[PDB]
Write a protein that binds this DNA or RNA. Structure first.
Ligand code: MG
Length: 81
RNA sequence: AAAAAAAAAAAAAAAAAAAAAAAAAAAAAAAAAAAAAAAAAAAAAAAAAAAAAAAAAAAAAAAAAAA
């Protein structure tokens, strides 16, 4: 009940996701720059966990999630630059 | 008066019993009767009778990270 892993709430196909593209899609793509700020990492993970909380209160996040999953696999889940 | 040594080396010696035609009995139904080395000489291991062997146990992984 305490591991609370935002990679696991949005996991797909045993592909342990790289949260750079997750923050580029689900929020502003400010986590696509660089410099590897850990405080930025935890803060964006906080924001994505809040996004999980909001759209799990909406409880329909798998629909648009799988739509943008297929859409980003047309992108092949790469880094948009 | 058939009157013989009275036992080495743990010697050595007894049996502890039969066709019965006694009386007017034919010619193997036995179940098989069945010997040869020795010129430096004969030589299975696995565990040993298939009187009934269906014999691919699904797979799919689009991929990571971890800024
Ligand atoms: Mg990652």
């Amino acid at each position: 009940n305490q591991i609370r892993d935002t990679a696991i709430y949005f996991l797909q196909g045993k592909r342990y996701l790289s949260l750079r593209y997750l923050a580029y899609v689900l929020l502003g793509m400010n986590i696509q720059e660089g410099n590897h700020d850990s405080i930025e990492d935890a803060h964006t993970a906080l924001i994505l966990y809040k996004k999980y909380l909001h759209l799990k209160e909406k409880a329909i996040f798998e629909k648009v999630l799988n739509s943008v999953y297929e859409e980003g696999r047309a992108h092949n889940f790469k880094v948009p630059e």
